[PDB]
Amino acid sequence: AEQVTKSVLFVCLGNICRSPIAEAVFRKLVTDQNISDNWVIDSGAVSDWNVGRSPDPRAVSCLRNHGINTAHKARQVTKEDFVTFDYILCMDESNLRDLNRKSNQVKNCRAKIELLGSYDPQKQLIIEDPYYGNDADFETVYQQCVRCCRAFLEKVR
Numbered sequence: 661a662e663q664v665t666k667s668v669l670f671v672c673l674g675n676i677c678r679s680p681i682a683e684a685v686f687r688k689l690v691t692d693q694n695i696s697d698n699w700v701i702d703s704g705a706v707s708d709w710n711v712g713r714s715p716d717p718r719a720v721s722c723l724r725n726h727g728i729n730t731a732h733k734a735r736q737v738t739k740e741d742f743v744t745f746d747y748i749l750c751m752d753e754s755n756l757r758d759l760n761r762k763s764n765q766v767k768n769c770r771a772k773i774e775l776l777g778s779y780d781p782q783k784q785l786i787i788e789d790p791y792y793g794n795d796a797d798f799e800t801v802y803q804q805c806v807r808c809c810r811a812f813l814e815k816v817r
């Protein structure tokens with residue numbers, strides 16, 4: 661079992677509710693497919709407001725309900741991210757304009773930046789901020805994440 665190494669960065673505004681869920685769903689898929697060793701995975705924020713913070717408690721419990729754990733600490737997206745990751749997947753059109761803006765300040769930008777929801781077989785393009793929502797909204801984000809992450813993986817696998 662030998663291949664090449666792929667990397668993906670999951671991105672949200674704060675890296676406290678959405679991307680940590682995406683990122684953790686993503687590792688599980690990869691681990692379950694016995695391909696971890698070929699993947700570098702990470703999650704980051706457009707904003708610095710919450711760096712160093714743990715994931716929101718409702719995101720932790722949501723993942724737990726699904727047999728998944730995370731140990732992530734929020735971090736900000738940097739310019740190196742644009743040259744180090746194959747893919748940068750974000751949650752919403754805002755994250756998307758924000759990143760295209762930064763990447764510009766990047767000379768040899770080698771990351772492909774897209775909406776994770778662009779991979780959704782159900783077509784729900786956007787992954788909504790569940791911050792002000794309830795446990796049900798966390799769950800629906802998880803759900804989207806699984807759909808989108810399996811769809812992305814079968815294609816870059």
Ligand code: MOO
Nearest residue numbers: 673674676677678
């Ligand atoms: O981490 Mo977020 O950008 O509040 O879902």
